[PDB]
Amino acid sequence: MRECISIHVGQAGVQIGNACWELYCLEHGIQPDGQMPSDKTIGGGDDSFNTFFSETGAGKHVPRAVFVDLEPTVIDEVRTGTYRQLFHPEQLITGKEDAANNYARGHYTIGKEIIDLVLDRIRKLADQCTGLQGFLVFHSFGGGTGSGFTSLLMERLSVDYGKKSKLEFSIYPAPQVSTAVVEPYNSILTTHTTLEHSDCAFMVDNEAIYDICRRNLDIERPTYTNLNRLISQIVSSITASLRFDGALNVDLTEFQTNLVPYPRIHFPLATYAPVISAEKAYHEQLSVAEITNACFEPANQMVKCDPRHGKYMACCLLYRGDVVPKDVNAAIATIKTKRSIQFVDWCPTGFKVGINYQPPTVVPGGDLAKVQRAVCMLSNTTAIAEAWARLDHKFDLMYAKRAFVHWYVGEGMEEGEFSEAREDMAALEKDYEEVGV
Amino acid sequence: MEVIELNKCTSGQSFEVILKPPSDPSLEEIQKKLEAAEERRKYQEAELLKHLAE
Amino acid sequence: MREIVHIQAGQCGNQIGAKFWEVISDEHGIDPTGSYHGDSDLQLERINVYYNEATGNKYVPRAILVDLEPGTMDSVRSGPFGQIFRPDNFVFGQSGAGNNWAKGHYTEGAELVDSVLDVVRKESESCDCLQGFQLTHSLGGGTGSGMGTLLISKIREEYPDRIMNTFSVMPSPKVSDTVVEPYNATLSVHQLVENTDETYCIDNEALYDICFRTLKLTTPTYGDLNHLVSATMSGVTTCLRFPGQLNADLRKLAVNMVPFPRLHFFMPGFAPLTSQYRALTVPELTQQMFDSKNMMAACDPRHGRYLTVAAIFRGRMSMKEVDEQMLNVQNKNSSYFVEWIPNNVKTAVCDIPPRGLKMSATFIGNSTAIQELFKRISEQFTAMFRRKAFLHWYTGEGMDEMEFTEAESNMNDLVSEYQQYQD
Amino acid sequence: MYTFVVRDENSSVYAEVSRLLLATGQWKRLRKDNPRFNLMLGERNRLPFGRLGHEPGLVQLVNYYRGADKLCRKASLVKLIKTSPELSESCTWFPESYVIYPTDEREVFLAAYNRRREGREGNVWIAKSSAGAGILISSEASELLDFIDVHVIQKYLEKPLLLEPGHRKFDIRSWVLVDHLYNIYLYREGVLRTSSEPYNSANFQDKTCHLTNHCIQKEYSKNYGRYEEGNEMFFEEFNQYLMDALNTTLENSILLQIKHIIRSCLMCIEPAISTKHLHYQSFQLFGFDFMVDEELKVWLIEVNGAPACAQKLYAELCQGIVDVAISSVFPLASIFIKLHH
Ligand SMILES: Nc1nc2c(ncn2[C@@H]2O[C@H](COP(=O)(O)OP(=O)(O)OP(=O)(O)O)[C@@H](O)[C@H]2O)c(=O)[nH]1
Ligand SMILES: Nc1ncnc2c1ncn2[C@@H]1O[C@H](COP(=O)(O)OP(=O)(O)CP(=O)(O)O)[C@@H](O)[C@H]1O
Ligand SMILES: Nc1nc2c(ncn2[C@@H]2O[C@H](COP(=O)(O)OP(=O)(O)O)[C@@H](O)[C@H]2O)c(=O)[nH]1
Ligand SMILES: [Ca+2]
Ligand SMILES: [Ca+2]
Ligand SMILES: [Ca+2]
Ligand SMILES: [Mg+2]
Ligand SMILES: [Mg+2]
Ligand SMILES: [Mg+2]
Secondary structure, rough: OOEEEEEHHHHHHHHHHHHHHHHHHHHHHOOOOOEOOOOOOOOOOOOOHHHHHEEEOOEEEEOOEEEOOOOOHHHHHHHOOOOOOHHHHHEEEEOOOOOOHHHHHHHHHOOHHHHHHHHHEEEEEEHHHOOOOEEEEEEEEOHHHHEEEEHHHHHHHHHOOOOOEEEEEEOOOOOOOOOOHHHHHHHHHHHHHHHHHHHHEEEHHHHHHHHHHHHHOOOOOOOOHHHHHHHHHHHHHHHHHHHHHOOOOOHHHHHHHHHHHOOOOOOOOOEEEOOOOOOOOOOOOHHHHHHHHHHHOHOOOOOOOOHOOEEEEEEEEEEEEOOOOOHHHHHHHHHHHHOOOEEOOOEEEEEEEEEOOOOOOOOOOOOOOOOEEEEEEEEHHHHHHHHHHHHHHHHHHHHHHOOHHHHHOOOOOOHHHHHHHHHHHHHHHHHHHHOOO | EEEEEEEEEOOEEEEEEEOOOOOOOOOHHHHHHHHHHHHHHHHHHHHHHHHHHH | OEEEEEEEEEHHHHHHHHHHHHHHHOOOOEOOOOOEEEOOOOHHHHHHEEEEHHHHHHHHEEEEEOOOOOHHHHHOOOOOHHHHHHHHHHOOOOOOOOOOHHHOOOOOHHHHHHHHHHHHHHHHHHOEEEEEEEEEEEEOHHHHHHHHHHHHHHHHHOOOOEEEEEEEEEEHHHOOOOOOOHHHHHHHHHHHHHHOOEEEEEEHHHHHHHHHHHOOOOOOOOHHHHHHHHHHHHHHHHHHHHHOOOOHHHHHHHHHHHOOOOEEEEEEEEOOOOOOOOOOOOHHHHHHHHOOOOOOHHHHHOOOOOOEEEEEEEEOOOHHHHHHHHHHHHOOEEEEEEEOOOOOOOEEOOOOOOOOOOOOOEEEEEHHHHHHHHHHHHHHHHHOOOOOOOOOHHHOOOOOHHHHHHHHHHHHHHEEEEEHHOO | EEEEOOOOOHHHHHHHHHHHHHHHOOEEEOOOOOOOOOEEEOOOOOHHHHHHOOOOOOOOOOOOOOOOOHHOHEEEEEEEEHHHHOOOOOOOOOEEEEEEOOOOOOHHHHHHHHHHHHHHOOOOEEEEEOOOOEEEEEEHHHHHHHHHHOOOEEOOOOOOOEEEOEEEEEEEOOOOOOOOOOOOOEOOOEEEEEEEEEEOOOOOOOOOOOOOOOHHHHHHHHOOOOOOOOEEHHHHHHHHHHHHHHOOOEEEEEEEOOOOHHHHHHHHHHHHHHHOOOOOOEEEEEEEEEEOOOOOOOOEEEOOOOOOOOHHHHHHHHHHHHHHHHOOOOOOOOOOOEEOO
């Protein structure tokens, strides 16, 4: 067993992390007070769930997580929430004033003053680890802390933990819920400085989650609570292999090996099905073939794009519930004859499949209905570069006029870092086009 | 359609299906950049105070 | 605990500032004696942004009242909410400023500014994390204009990393007290261009036309004008006073509204404006909110382009229908929004509506059409300055004609800067 | 009111469509780089499909199918027909073609060539590509490969149907409109682009009688406009000719094969280009070009992704584009034959 440390940065990361750990506890049978009746090894052990939970002599299971935000209002909700007892104060780090949606303010001005403290609180959790695998970093692209401070943290983690893996869960900005005009700036700035320090990053576009909530859950105006409960389901399906017995994606290193043959192209596309509304008594349970076929519908992807007009480098299928390999292969065979699925020539045309018999757990009283079987597809397709194109275009529109640039220069950032970051994205879009067209 | 490396356990199983075969900066360098940014802030603030002093 | 320090200076500044505290005090359930009597916890969740909590659970506005004459401030202390202000925060002289920017900025005002800063420092010291300052004042007088901009310059020197926000009332010959108002306004605007991050341009001409044309008030008074300002100030500060995601503090507001440092002069708007029991639909709020007749700066938005826009809807309404109508406005009139700032229109919704209204909407626009306001002031300035008329009032206080020439040039530069982004 | 943008100024078809949309009083044209549009008349090259369908509150429609280039390119079409089981290598309405690079099919092309040579069968082939105005028609294989030094070599139809009087060659242009629901609409009006020179099967060097291009006939042909105005014969005259001469109709002898060919090509790529469940919608106007041999068998020549219309038909067709493709998605306040499938 090897431990994994979760780091939640900014409002988006903290609120998403709070939703995930709530779901983790429900899946592992951990109660709000940290007690786990099914755990018979009191005060220790090297079970699969221990990769995310440590144990005290009193039997409390404490998440291996750190919450960081430059403003206390969001983390204070964790201090007084339903799962307040899970965490101890050393895990929650808050400042006095935030980064004001300013990457430079979160990275340089405020980041320089709090970075050493965060590393210290992380070093404490690492000291509890007998064989630390690495870190899962949750954050937004558009926020000043999620973008600015995260990149500084990722840089320092590569220094203090050179051999550890680092995976991201990143929130792509969507105007329908976005709160700042400069989020394209912060997105491209944080992606530039973080690119070399992240081994695998799962981008979630709020636009996609927003419409999935409106269309499949019948939410007229989805809130962050609606969005985060759905996101935590996706994240749970991705991390389930680290927390349960199995043989696929059993450690962080395997994520890169199975999904990232090219290091810079490390943004796998996530597709989840089925998303059923709990406001209907009965719904016809979807088969393995129907939920697997849904993994190739753009309407179910975490990022709206068209994989038909790209190429696959890898594809994993993560099933949860009543699923046997026989039905998976039969479903895949049918889908190949009907779907446009092109792989790169230097890659094998195949699917790595993982099945966990325990069906998905749903938050009691939430919006998602319990289902007999669900699947999350992790496919590394060049089509996800469409999200980079949209982001780079908006960047170009504002930066051509130098709009809002003075806010960043005023924090000590040089104007050259803008073009330097934009040129890196230009090479990134070029890599995707070379690989997929 | 080849099915390989089937692993079964009490809580599930995993396998692979092949449809077709194929055809950092140092801790010192980071500190300098953070300090360089802080120096540009101090310089800009000193200019403001100088301007206000006039 | 992101505290704001409020300052009101001069006759206009104190009369409008007093109405502002009367209005928001009612919204937060605070009575004249500072006692809370509300039925919602939202009233108190962010009460500390504008109020200090004293002994006995009293809430004391974090406000400083400044004036070179005692008259107007005596009326405030004797007003409806006069007792709610901290007595030590009344800082005033006896000479007055005679509607003279030089007196407020260089002579009479300089003698009193240090005592004001002492009170500001006392308030700031007891702030967990000071956001910044908001100043209410007019630009056509002497105290609010001349001494107000002097205070701003010295507040920036002592708090250079804090946000400065002002509600600045622009003079108009239609609602004028003296002929030198264009002089005082021109000298002040350059101070604002340099030393504020956000300025709501409240045009007395617009306030008059709205009271006369729309509200059907034949003989508008200053009190009538201040009714519109109170409602607008309450609207533009809703995101600061109640829980929310968008523009929740002064610095994030500036980041969303100011793409270029000098272009930070906003056109506020309010809806509805009824001359009154009829229910208002979300489509009606949106169209009225964007209608120039609801603008407070007397500028035609269709004569320029919107750099950024902040919209705040108050009351229990269809949030889905709000997004639809907001998207409808931008999609139908997209030509008036600069295309090089994607998604420059941000919308916020607050459940608590203003007093006497089921729902309302406040508009905050950074439009290049605001140059029409500065051109108007610039024309009135030159008409007199070309003959050096009325300058002796200012040279008598030590000022030189060169300082007027430089203020004139600075104003014309600001107009040219707006013009380059309008093409 | 609906909004649209124009990003291809050289499109005569959509220049007319834009002119029609404005005249309805219900459509407004924005700047070409304004993202808040309902409809995009996109550019021919590098149309940014990835930026469509990300505008809240706007149903967005584009006039091009992403991925339809596979059908509208010389080499792409050949590869698509040979490799797609729906069309298959045994396809009977597409001339025997081979992809030749200056993978490659040089050795397979020569293998079939030699078979025809020994069998005394006609061995005339044509080499062309997507970079033409330039073509070469030769009976010796060695001449074809030397000329190329991406191109496609396909069997030149040595026995075309010849219109009389004139003993001349022609090709049939069909306009097909596919809407957002993937309904295939065939414009009832076609055009025969005829050659004004008598077909001379002796010397293929004089291309004035072998190439039916409107431009070639208007510059290199001595009899341009002699038999029909602009070397363009419409279906009414052509149908009457088939009745008076061949004792048949255009519908039975030719149009059935054309409709069949249009269905097969478009249905083949439907899974790859359909925008049924996509965040944006697409429609597209296609230009199918056919050849008819003396046996009254129809052969597909190529498919145009950005075709131009005939002068006499711009009004009717462009108005049809608005009714079927645009108004169906954005209703306001049949000249097509629906090919069911
Ligand atoms: N899915 C999801 N997105 C969120 C959530 N909270 C904020 N966001 C998104 O994050 C972006 C803003 O960044 P934040 O995380 O809120 O800002 P921050 O990281 O706290 O940094 P600051 O500027 O200092 O406040 C916007 O695009 C929001 O839509 C959340 O709870 N769930
Ligand atoms: N295999 C073949 N057999 C007989 N004739 C052929 C032929 N291929 C081409 N032609 C003749 O050559 C002409 C030009 O062919 P092609 O369509 O490839 O060129 P093009 O793409 O430049 C014109 P367009 O874009 O309008 O179709 C055709 O109209 C046809 O008359
Ligand atoms: N809206 C409004 N404007 C005022 C009020 N009082 C004065 N003004 C305007 O302010 C200018 C006069 O400035 P004033 O505040 O009286 O001078 P000061 O006391 O020296 O700062 C003129 O343009 C007046 O029109 C008021 O109560 N409301
Ligand atoms: Ca244990
Ligand atoms: Ca590394
Ligand atoms: Ca004195
Ligand atoms: Mg924050
Ligand atoms: Mg006065
Ligand atoms: Mg062609």
